[PDB]
Amino acid sequence: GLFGAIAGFIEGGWQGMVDGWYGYHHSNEQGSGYAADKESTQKAIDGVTNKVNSIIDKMNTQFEAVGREFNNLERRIENLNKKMEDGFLDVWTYNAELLVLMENERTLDFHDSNVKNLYDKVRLQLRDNAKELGNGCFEFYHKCDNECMESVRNGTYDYPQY
Amino acid sequence: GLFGAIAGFIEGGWQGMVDGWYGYHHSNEQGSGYAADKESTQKAIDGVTNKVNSIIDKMNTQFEAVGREFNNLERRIENLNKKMEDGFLDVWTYNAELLVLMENERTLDFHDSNVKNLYDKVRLQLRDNAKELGNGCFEFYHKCDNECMESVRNGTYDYPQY
Amino acid sequence: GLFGAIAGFIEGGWQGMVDGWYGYHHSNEQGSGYAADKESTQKAIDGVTNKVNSIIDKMNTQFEAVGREFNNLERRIENLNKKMEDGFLDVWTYNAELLVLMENERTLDFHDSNVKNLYDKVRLQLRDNAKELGNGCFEFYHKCDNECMESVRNGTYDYPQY
Amino acid sequence: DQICIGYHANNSTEQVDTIMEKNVTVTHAQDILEKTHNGKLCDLDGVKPLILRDCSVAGWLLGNPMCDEFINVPEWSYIVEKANPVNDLCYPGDFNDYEELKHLLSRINHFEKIQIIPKSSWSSHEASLGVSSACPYQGKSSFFRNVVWLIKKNSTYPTIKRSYNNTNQEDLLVLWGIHHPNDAAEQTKLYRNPTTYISVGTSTLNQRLVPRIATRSKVNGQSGRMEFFWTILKPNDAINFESNGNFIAPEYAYKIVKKGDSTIMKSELEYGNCNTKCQTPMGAINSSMPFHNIHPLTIGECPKYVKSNRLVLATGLRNSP
Amino acid sequence: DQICIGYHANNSTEQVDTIMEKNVTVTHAQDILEKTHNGKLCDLDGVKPLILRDCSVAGWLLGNPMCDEFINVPEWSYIVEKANPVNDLCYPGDFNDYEELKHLLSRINHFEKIQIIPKSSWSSHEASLGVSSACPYQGKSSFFRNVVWLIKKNSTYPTIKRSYNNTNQEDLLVLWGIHHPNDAAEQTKLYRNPTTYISVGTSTLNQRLVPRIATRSKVNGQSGRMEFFWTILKPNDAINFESNGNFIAPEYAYKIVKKGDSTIMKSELEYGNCNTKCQTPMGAINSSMPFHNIHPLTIGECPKYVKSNRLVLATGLRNSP
Amino acid sequence: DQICIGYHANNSTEQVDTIMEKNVTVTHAQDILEKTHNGKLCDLDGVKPLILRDCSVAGWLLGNPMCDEFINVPEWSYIVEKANPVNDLCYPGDFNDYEELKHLLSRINHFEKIQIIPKSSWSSHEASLGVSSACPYQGKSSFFRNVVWLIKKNSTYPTIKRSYNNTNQEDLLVLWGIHHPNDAAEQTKLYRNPTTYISVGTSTLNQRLVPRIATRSKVNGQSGRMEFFWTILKPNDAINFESNGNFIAPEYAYKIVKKGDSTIMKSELEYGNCNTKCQTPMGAINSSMPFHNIHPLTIGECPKYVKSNRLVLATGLRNSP
Numbered sequence A, B, C: 001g002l003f004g005a006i007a008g009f010i011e012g013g014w015q016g017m018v019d020g021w022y023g024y025h026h027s028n029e030q031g032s033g034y035a036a037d038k039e040s041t042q043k044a045i046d047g048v049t050n051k052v053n054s055i056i057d058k059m060n061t062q063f064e065a066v067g068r069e070f071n072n073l074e075r076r077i078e079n080l081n082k083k084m085e086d087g088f089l090d091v092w093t094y095n096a097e098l099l100v101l102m103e104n105e106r107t108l109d110f111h112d113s114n115v116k117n118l119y120d121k122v123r124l125q126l127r128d129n130a131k132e133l134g135n136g137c138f139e140f141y142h143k144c145d146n147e148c149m150e151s152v153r154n155g156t157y158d159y160p161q162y
Numbered sequence D, E, F: 001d002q003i004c005i006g007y008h009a010n011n012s013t014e015q016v017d018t019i020m021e022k023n024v025t026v027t028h029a030q031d032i033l034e035k036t037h038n039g040k041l042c043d044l045d046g047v048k049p050l051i052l053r054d055c056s057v058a059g060w061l062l063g064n065p066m067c068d069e070f071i072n073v074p075e076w077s078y079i080v081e082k083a084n085p086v087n088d089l090c091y092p093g094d095f096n097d098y099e100e101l102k103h104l105l106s107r108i109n110h111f112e113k114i115q116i117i118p119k120s121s122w123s124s125h126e127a128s129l130g131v132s133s134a135c136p137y138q139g140k141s142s143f144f145r146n147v148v149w150l151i152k153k154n155s156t157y158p159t160i161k162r163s164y165n166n167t168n169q170e171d172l173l174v175l176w177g178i179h180h181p182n183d184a185a186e187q188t189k190l191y192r193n194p195t196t197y198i199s200v201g202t203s204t205l206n207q208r209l210v211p212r213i214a215t216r217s218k219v220n221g222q223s224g225r226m227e228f229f230w231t232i233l234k235p236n237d238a239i240n241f242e243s244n245g246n247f248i249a250p251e252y253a254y255k256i257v258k259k260g261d262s263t264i265m266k267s268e269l270e271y272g273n274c275n276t277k278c279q280t281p282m283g284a285i286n287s288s289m290p291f292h293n294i295h296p297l298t299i300g301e302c303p304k305y306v307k308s309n310r311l312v313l314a315t316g317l318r319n320s321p
C-alpha cells in the first residue's frame, strides 16, 4: 500500500482487536491486550460512509431506457434507438465499474494512511524513551505499567517524567 | 488528511503567514516571525494552475443541444430526441461534478503532502541538533540566531558547525 | 511527487542501476555498485501491468458508429443521428484522455511511494548504527563489508551484532 | 515492556477489485448491485397491470372477439404484451400509425369505453351482416366489436353523413376503418357503388380514403384487407364522416380519463399474484441497492440498471491471511 | 530557540466538497459555474435576432397580413418564436413538411424576397378576389401576401401552365398551396371544374395534388382548408405548374443569400436592447466561466451547460477554524 | 562506508501528461493509440469487398447497363460506394424507400440473382422496345437489365395479370417500377389506355400505383420519370401484379442466400490488393493497440475509435535529466 503500514512494516492485522479498525496492543508486567483508537476509527467510519453515499448519490441521475416500437420500414430509426439506448448503458456501466475500482484503491490506501498517521503520532511522543523495533512496536527503556500505557493512548505521555 | 501534516500533527494554519502557502516560523533571542518557503509554494501554485486549466480544457469538448421540432404524429422520434439530449447532459453533469469531487480531494491531499515534505526536509537537516517537539516545531539545543535560522531555510544548515 | 523521495530528498535516478526500478548503491573498502531490490521492483511491475490491462479492458466496451443514410427530407433525423454518434465519441474520448491523465499521475506517485517505503525499511533497520545523510544515503559508524551490505539488502541486518 | 500500533483483521472472505489488483480480500465490503428478482409479473404499488395475454393492443382496441376478456378493462399500472400475440387483426390488414398510438398508451392508465354511433342507428344501411370466418366467435362468423362493417340494404348504398360531438370533458380516441375488396365484382356485391370513398373531418383532420383493389394472398382464409385509422378528438370538437361504401364505422370509442406513468412491457410471462415497487419484464425487484443488472426497461421506483455482473465497494481494510 | 513548519490560514469561508467530506472550508477556491444571466434577448455580436413576436414561421413566410412587420426582414443572428404564436395560418390548414423547413432555417441567416409570378400576370383568371374573413387586414378580408388565391374569370377556369426559371445564383425557396373546399357546390362556385388537380415539376419534384373534400369544423370561421407545399429550386432549374383549379399560386419566393450558424429559439421574451456573445432563451450570458447552468439551447461562444447548482474547485488548502 | 536507496534512470525521452504537469519525461511508457493505416481498401479476413466503383446501389440492383461489372457478384465482406456515383438512375426518377433498403444490405453478404418473369413470357405485350437514350449501352438505347419496360403491342395494352410464387427457401428481393410520362399524348402513344394503374399484392403488401403526369426539366435528356418500388417476398408467399400500362415489370429478382455482418462504406478509394482484420474508409488497420484515431466507421476486429492525437501511459518513473 501507498503509505507502507498495512501489510508493509506492519506484517498483518489483529484478529484480537474487535472494537475498532486501528489501535494499540500493549505488553507489560501486569499483562497484555488490545485497545482500539476511537478517534481515528470513527474518523475513518465517517469518511467511508460519506464516500458510499456520495457514490450512490452521483449515480442517482442516470439514463433510463424507454420502450419504443417501430414498423417494418422504420429499421433505421429502430437501429438508431437501439444504438442510442445501448450507448448510454455502456457509458453508465463504465462509469460505475471504474468509480468503484478507483475508489476501492483509494479506500484501502486511506486505511493505510490512518494507520501510518497513528503510528507516527505515537512515534513523536515516545521519541528517545523507547526503541523503535521496525514492525509497528515500540520497546520501552523505562518500565511501563497500565497508566503509562494509557498515557501513550491518551496523547498525554510526558517525556520529562521519563 | 492522507499525509498527516495539515490538521494532523500540525494542529492549524497561520493567519500571520501571508506571503505563501507553506513556510517557517522562528523564535529566538532576537525575535520571531513567519517566512514563506518560496520554492515549495510556487511549485504548488503551478500544480494547481495546471490542474484547473486541464479540467477546463478536458470539458471544452462536450455535448451541445440543438433545437429540433416534430409534428403531432412524430411523438416517438420527439421522445427519442428528448431522451438523447437529456442523456448526454446527465452524463456530462456527472463527469463535471465527479471530476471536481475527486480532484478537490486530491488538491487538499497535495497541499498536505507539500507540508509534510517540507517538514521532513528540515527534519533531515537538524537531525540530532534539535528536539522534535511533535507539533511541527524543532527546539534547538544550541542557541540559534537569525543567520542560524536563515541557514535552515536556506538548506545550508551545517551539522558539523553545531 | 507526493511521497517526497523521487526528485525530492533523492535528487535523481541512477543510470548505473539497470536490472531494476528501485535498489541500493553501496560504498566500502572493497568497492562499490548497484543492486536492484527484486521484491519491490516485481511488485511494482505487477501493479502497473494490471493497471494497463484494467484500462484496456474497461475501454473494451465502447460506442461503435454505424453507417446510416437519410434522404433530402429527413434532415432532422440525419442531424439527430449525427449529433448522437458524435456525442458518444466525445464522451468516450473524454473518458480515455482523463483516465490516462489520472492514472499517469497515480503511476508516478506509486513509484515514489515504493522508493519511500524501501527507504524507510532500511531506515528502520539501521536505526542508530548509521548517520542518515538526508539524500537517500546512510553512512555507517561501524565499518561495513559486502556481507554487512548484503545483510541490509537481506533484511537480516542485526542491530545487536553492531 | 512494549506498545504496538496495528489494525483489524477478521474471518472475512469478501473480495473487491482495484485498478492494480484484482480479488483483494477485505474485512468489510458493501455490495451495491441487486442480482436477483422474483421472476414474476406483479402489481405496481397495488395497481394491477393490464396483461393482454394472447391479444395485441390492436386486437384489444378494435375489439377482436377473441379479446372479450379485455372489454372494459379497469385502470392499469403498466401493460404487458407478448412478442408475437396470436390474436392480433383477425381479419387481415393494417393498423395505420400503430406505433404512434402505442406511444400514446405509454402515457395512459385508463380508458372508459362509450358508444358514439349506435348499431341500431343505421336505418339506411345493413349493420348485422358485417362478419367473417377469419374473425370467429363461438364457432360462428363475427367481427371487431367496436366497429360496424356496413353493407348495402336492399341493393342500395346511399351516401352516409354522420357526426359525433365530443361533449364529455375527456379527450376521445376514435377508431374507424376501410375495407379493400379483392375485385370489382366484390365491390358491387357488398356496396353496389363501383367507386367509393370515406371522408373524415375534424378541427385538424382532413382525410379522404379510397379502396385500393388488388389480388392478395389469403391470410386467415381471406384475401380482402382492412385498414384501420384513428384520431384523438379534442373536447367540444366534432368528427364528420361521409362515404359511398367500404366504410367500417365506429360504434364504440375509448375515453381517456386518466393519463400518467405507464409502459408497454414485452414479456411472455403471465400474472404472478404479487405486489412490488419496481417491475421488469423478467420479474420484480425488491431491494435498497443503488444498482441492479436484471433488465433495462423497468417501471416504478427502481435502482439504476447497469451491465455489470459484480459491483462491490471496499468499506474495510486489506484483511490479513 | 525553535523553528516550526506550518501553513497558511485566512478569513476565508469558501467551502468545497470532496468524496469523503462535504463543506470543507478552504483558503482559496475557484467557482467555475456561471449562475446568472441578464434575462433579456440581445443582439449576437452586433447582429439583431429576428423576433417574430406573435407571428409563426409559417405566418411569416406565407405572409399572413398580421405579419406585415416581417415583410422583407434584414439579416438575423438567430430567430425567436413564441411557444403558441397567435398569428399562424389565419386561413385554417396545414403546412407540409413544416419541421423539415424549420430545420433548413436553422442554417439560414438571410432571405431576399423576390417576385416570380406577378399578380397582374394572370390574364385568363381572377387574382384580386382570393380573400377571406379568417385572414383579415385593417378590418377587411385579405390573404397570405406571398401567394395568389386564383379563382374563375367569367365562369371559366382554363388550364394554367406557368414556369419560372431560377436564373439568379442563389437557391430559391418556392411556396405554393392548394384549396380544399367544403362540398361539390363550393368547388364549381369558385373553380367551375368539378375534378381538378395541381401538377408541380422540377429536376427532382414530381407532384400532383388533388383537392380532398370533407365537411370540417369551422376554424377561424371557415370550414375550408389550405395545404401549403414548398421546394428548394436549385440554380439554373425551372419549376413548372399546371392546374384546373384550387391552385394557390406563388407571387413572391424567398432567395437564400446567406447560410450560416443560426437557430430557432422558443421564448416568450421580447427584445431587450442589449448585445452579447452568448444567448439563451431565458437571457444572455457574459462570463469567462467554463460552465453555466442557465439553459441547454444556446447560440454563440458559450460556456458548457451542466445541470449542477454548484461547481467549485479547491485551489488553496484546508482553512483552520 | 555507506549504503544508499535510489531509483532507475535511463536515456529515455518518452513523455506523458498528468493533471498537474504536462510533458513529464519517464523511463518507460506504453503508447495505446494506433495512428497509422495502409491507406487502402482491402479484403476482410480473405473476403473481398464489393467495390461498386462509379455505380450506386440503385444502379447495381436495378441493373444499369453501365453496371454490367456487378451483374451476379460473389459474396462480399463489406460494400464500398462513392459519395456521388455517376452511374445511378440512368433514366431519371426516384427509388422508393431507398435508404431502408440500403439498411437491409448492411445485414446481407450475398445475393443470388434469378429470373422470376421471363422476358419472352410477354406474349400479349411488347418487351424489346422499352429503351432510352438516357440509359445507353455500347452507343445504343438500352435499359435497366433487371426490369422490363413493357409497351403496347399492335395498338393495344390488355390488362396484365401475373403472379410469382416464392418456392425457394430464401427470402426474395423483388424490384419493379412505374413510368410517369410527360403528357396525355405520350400516355396513349406508349400504352393506349389514358387512365392506368399498377396493383401489387402479397401477404402484407397492398399497393395501387397510378402515373402522375407533370411537365419536368430534362434530366439526362429526358423529362419522363421512373419510380422504383420493392418488397421482400417471404418463403412460400406469392406476389400478384395487375396493370393497364406504365408498368415496369420484374425480370430478375435477387435471392438472399447469406445474411451477416456487413456495411456500406463511403469512400472514393479503389481496391488495394491487400488483406486485413479491420477496415476503415481511409485505409486498413493492423495493430494490437486498444485504440485508434483513423475513422469512426470501421468493420472487423478493430481497436476503439477516439478523437485523440495522443494517448500514452506511464509505466516507468520520472526520468532524471
Ligand SMILES: CC(=O)N[C@@H]1[C@@H](O[C@@H]2O[C@H](CO)[C@H](O)[C@H](O[C@]3(C(=O)O)C[C@H](O)[C@@H](NC(C)=O)[C@H]([C@H](O)[C@H](O)CO)O3)[C@H]2O)[C@H](O)[C@@H](CO)O[C@H]1O
Residues within 6 Å of the ligand: D129, D130, D131, D132, D133, D134, D141, D149, D151, D180, D181, D182, D186, D190, D221, D222, D223, D224, D225
Ligand atoms: C358464400 C360462399 O360460401 N362462397 C364460397 C366461396 O367462399 C367465399 O369466397 C369469398 C370471396 O372469394 C369470401 O372470401 C367468403 O368469405 C367471407 C368471409 O370473410 O367469411 C364470407 C362473409 O360473409 C363475407 N362478409 C361480408 C360482410 O361480405 C366476406 C367478405 O365478402 C369478404 O371477406 C370481403 O373481401 O367473405 C368465402 O366464404 C368459395 O371461394 C367458392 C369456391 O371457390 O365456393 C363458394 O360457395
Ligand SMILES: CC(=O)N[C@@H]1[C@@H](O[C@@H]2O[C@H](CO)[C@H](O)[C@H](O[C@]3(C(=O)O)C[C@H](O)[C@@H](NC(C)=O)[C@H]([C@H](O)[C@H](O)CO)O3)[C@H]2O)[C@H](O)[C@@H](CO)O[C@H]1O
Residues within 6 Å of the ligand: E129, E130, E131, E132, E133, E134, E141, E149, E151, E180, E181, E182, E186, E190, E221, E222, E223, E224, E225
Ligand atoms: C356571401 C355570404 O355572405 N354568405 C353567407 C354565408 O357565409 C359564407 O359561407 C361560405 C361557405 O359556407 C364561406 O365560408 C364564406 O366565407 C368566405 C370567407 O372565407 O370569408 C367568403 C369569401 O369571399 C370566400 N372567398 C373565396 C375566394 O371564395 C371564401 C371561400 O369561398 C371559402 O372559404 C372556401 O372554402 O369564403 C361565408 O361568408 C352564410 O353561411 C349564410 C348563412 O348560413 O348566409 C350567407 O349570406
Ligand SMILES: CC(=O)N[C@@H]1[C@@H](O[C@@H]2O[C@H](CO)[C@H](O)[C@H](O[C@]3(C(=O)O)C[C@H](O)[C@@H](NC(C)=O)[C@H]([C@H](O)[C@H](O)CO)O3)[C@H]2O)[C@H](O)[C@@H](CO)O[C@H]1O
Residues within 6 Å of the ligand: F129, F130, F131, F132, F133, F134, F141, F149, F151, F180, F181, F182, F186, F190, F221, F222, F223, F224, F225
Ligand atoms: C422519335 C424522335 O426522334 N423524336 C424527336 C423528339 O425527341 C423525342 O422526344 C420524346 C418526348 O418529347 C422522347 O424524349 C424521346 O426519347 C425517348 C428516349 O427516352 O430515348 C425515345 C425512346 O424510344 C422512348 N422509349 C419508349 C419505350 O417510349 C422514350 C419514351 O417515350 C419517353 O422517355 C417516355 O417519357 O423517349 C425523344 O427521342 C424531339 O423532341 C423532336 C424535336 O423537338 O424531334 C423528334 O423527331
Ligand SMILES: *[C@@H]1O[C@H](CO)[C@@H](O)[C@H](O[C@@H]2O[C@H](CO)[C@@H](O)[C@H](O)[C@H]2NC(C)=O)[C@H]1NC(C)=O
Residues within 6 Å of the ligand: D165, D166, D167, D236, D237, D238, E217
Ligand atoms: C359541439 O361541437 C361544436 C363544434 O363543432 C361546439 O361549438 C358545440 O359547443 C357549442 O357551440 C356553440 C356554437 O355552435 C356555442 O355557442 C356554445 O358556446 C358551445 N358550447 C360549449 C359548451 O362550448 C358542441 N355542442 C354542444 C356543447 O352542445
Ligand SMILES: *[C@@H]1O[C@H](CO)[C@@H](O)[C@H](O[C@@H]2O[C@H](CO)[C@@H](O)[C@H](O)[C@H]2NC(C)=O)[C@H]1NC(C)=O
Residues within 6 Å of the ligand: E165, E166, E167, E236, E237, E238, F217
Ligand atoms: C433556364 O433553365 C433551363 C433548364 O430548365 C436552363 O437550361 C437555362 O439555361 C440555359 O439552357 C440552355 C439550353 O436550353 C443552355 O444552352 C445554356 O447554356 C443555359 N445557360 C446557362 C447560363 O446555364 C435557363 N435559362 C437561362 C439561363 O436563360
Ligand SMILES: *[C@@H]1O[C@H](CO)[C@@H](O)[C@H](O[C@@H]2O[C@H](CO)[C@@H](O)[C@H](O)[C@H]2NC(C)=O)[C@H]1NC(C)=O
Residues within 6 Å of the ligand: D217, F165, F166, F167, F236, F237, F238
Ligand atoms: C405457392 O404459394 C402459395 C400461397 O400463395 C402456397 O400455399 C403454396 O404452397 C402450397 O399451398 C397449398 C395450398 O394451396 C398447400 O396445401 C401446400 O401445403 C403448400 N406447400 C408447401 C410446401 O407449403 C406455394 N406453392 C407451391 C409450394 O407449390
Ligand SMILES: *[C@H]1O[C@H](CO)[C@@H](O[C@@H]2O[C@H](CO)[C@@H](O)[C@H](O)[C@H]2NC(C)=O)[C@H](O)[C@H]1NC(C)=O
Residues within 6 Å of the ligand: A146, A147, A148, A150, A151, A154, A156
Ligand atoms: C489518561 O490516562 C492517564 C493515566 O491513566 C490519566 O492520568 C491519571 O488520571 C487519574 C484519574 O484522574 C489520576 O488519579 C492519576 O493521578 C493520573 N495518573 C497518571 C500516571 O497520570 C489522565 O488523566 C488521562 N488523560 C486523558 C484521558 O486525557
Ligand SMILES: *[C@H]1O[C@H](CO)[C@@H](O[C@@H]2O[C@H](CO)[C@@H](O)[C@H](O)[C@H]2NC(C)=O)[C@H](O)[C@H]1NC(C)=O
Residues within 6 Å of the ligand: B146, B147, B148, B150, B151, B154, B156
Ligand atoms: C543563506 O543564509 C546564510 C546565513 O544567513 C548565508 O551565509 C552567510 O552569508 C553571508 C552573505 O554572503 C556571509 O557574509 C556570512 O558569512 C554567512 N553567514 C553564515 C552564518 O553562514 C548563506 O550564504 C545563504 N545561502 C544561500 C542563500 O544559499
Ligand SMILES: *[C@H]1O[C@H](CO)[C@@H](O[C@@H]2O[C@H](CO)[C@@H](O)[C@H](O)[C@H]2NC(C)=O)[C@H](O)[C@H]1NC(C)=O
Residues within 6 Å of the ligand: C146, C147, C148, C150, C151, C154, C156
Ligand atoms: C543474506 O546475506 C547474509 C550475509 O551475506 C547471509 O549470512 C551469511 O550466510 C552465509 C551463507 O549461508 C554464511 O556462511 C555466513 O556465515 C553468513 N554471514 C553473515 C555475516 O551473516 C544470510 O544468510 C543471507 N540471508 C538471506 C538471504 O535471507
Ligand SMILES: *[C@@H]1O[C@H](CO)[C@@H](O)[C@H](O)[C@H]1NC(C)=O
Residues within 6 Å of the ligand: D022, D023
Ligand atoms: C478472481 O476471482 C474470480 C472468482 O473467484 C476468478 O474467476 C478470477 O479468475 C479471479 N481473477 C483474477 C485476476 O485473479
Ligand SMILES: *[C@@H]1O[C@H](CO)[C@@H](O)[C@H](O)[C@H]1NC(C)=O
Residues within 6 Å of the ligand: E022, E023
Ligand atoms: C453543506 O452546506 C449547505 C449550505 O451551506 C447545507 O445546506 C448542506 O446541508 C450542508 N451539507 C452537509 C452534508 O453538511
Ligand SMILES: *[C@@H]1O[C@H](CO)[C@@H](O)[C@H](O)[C@H]1NC(C)=O
Residues within 6 Å of the ligand: F022, F023
Ligand atoms: C509539450 O510538448 C509538445 C510537443 O513536444 C509541445 O508542442 C507543447 O507545447 C508542450 N506543452 C506544454 C504544456 O509544455
